[PDB]
């Protein structure tokens with residue numbers, strides 16, 4: 001039996017590029033990525049699953065935006081940021097990234113959900 | 121947002137005593153227990169959440185059955201065993217315990233699900 005991780009996605013994220021990470025593992029790796037995420041970024045599942053999402057950053061990504069995300073994760077709060085991200089072919093897009101924490105019944109942090117929206 | 125852990129329970133477990141444990145945490149603690157489990161065993165949620173399920177064992181529980189469960193968990197396979205368990209008031213009941221592993225998309229073990237059925 002494989003856990004249905006998508007059973008935790010909001011209504012808005014259903015047809016979206018979305019990823020879940022596991023902050024209890026070293027380096028906060030992705031444990032689920034939606035097909036829309038893979039289509040947008042140009043990766044196969046094996047290329048991104050189990051990796052920290054920093055692979056989306058590239059040479060002109062703003063380092064303060066990266067640190068803002070890092071601090072937002074440590075705060076365990078809902079936050080959104082516009083950040084320059086890159087596909088496998090090196091093309092760049094402005095990503096409106098929305099992150100939210102997901103807790104277990106005891107109240108301990110369990111996952112992060114991150115939804116990607118290219119800014120048009 | 122609290123994860124809907126019950127979104128991973130089978131059809132049979134829905135009205136059942138069921139618990140989920142997190143084997144990635146030290147001592148494989150419970151992270152979800154159903155109300156039917158709490159009613160059967162006589163505990164409040166705060167008394168059992170975050171604890172290893174060994175609190176259900178008592179003075180006449182068979183130590184080989186306990187070790188069989190331990191080995192079955194290490195095998196990461198589906199298994200069922202009849203084991204003597206105890207409620208908070210010290211009364212005993214034969215528990216038909218069914219355990220199954222739950223994996224993440226990458227194929228790594230994620231949770232154990234355990235369903236309890238008193239043998240009548």
Ligand SMILES: Cc1cc2nc3c(=O)[nH]c(=O)nc-3n(C[C@H](O)[C@H](O)[C@H](O)COP(=O)(O)O)c2cc1C
Nearest residue numbers: 019020021052053054056057066069070112113114
């Ligand atoms: C669930 C989740 C989704 C994320 N999605 C993105 C993303 O789409 N683009 C991005 O640049 N960073 C994303 N991140 C952030 C990176 O994984 C990483 O946390 C960020 O680069 C800051 O951490 P670092 O200083 O270790 O790089 C996401 C993080 C999480 C937890």
Ligand SMILES: Cc1cc2nc3c(=O)[nH]c(=O)nc-3n(C[C@H](O)[C@H](O)[C@H](O)COP(=O)(O)O)c2cc1C
Nearest residue numbers: 139140141172173174176177186189190232233234
């Ligand atoms: C999900 C789950 C449910 C369990 N339910 C029971 C149970 O109902 N009764 C019981 O005696 N042991 C149950 N166990 C087993 C104990 O938690 C523990 O694994 C067992 O006692 C063997 O491990 P130990 O040698 O550390 O005690 C359950 C284990 C898991 C992972």
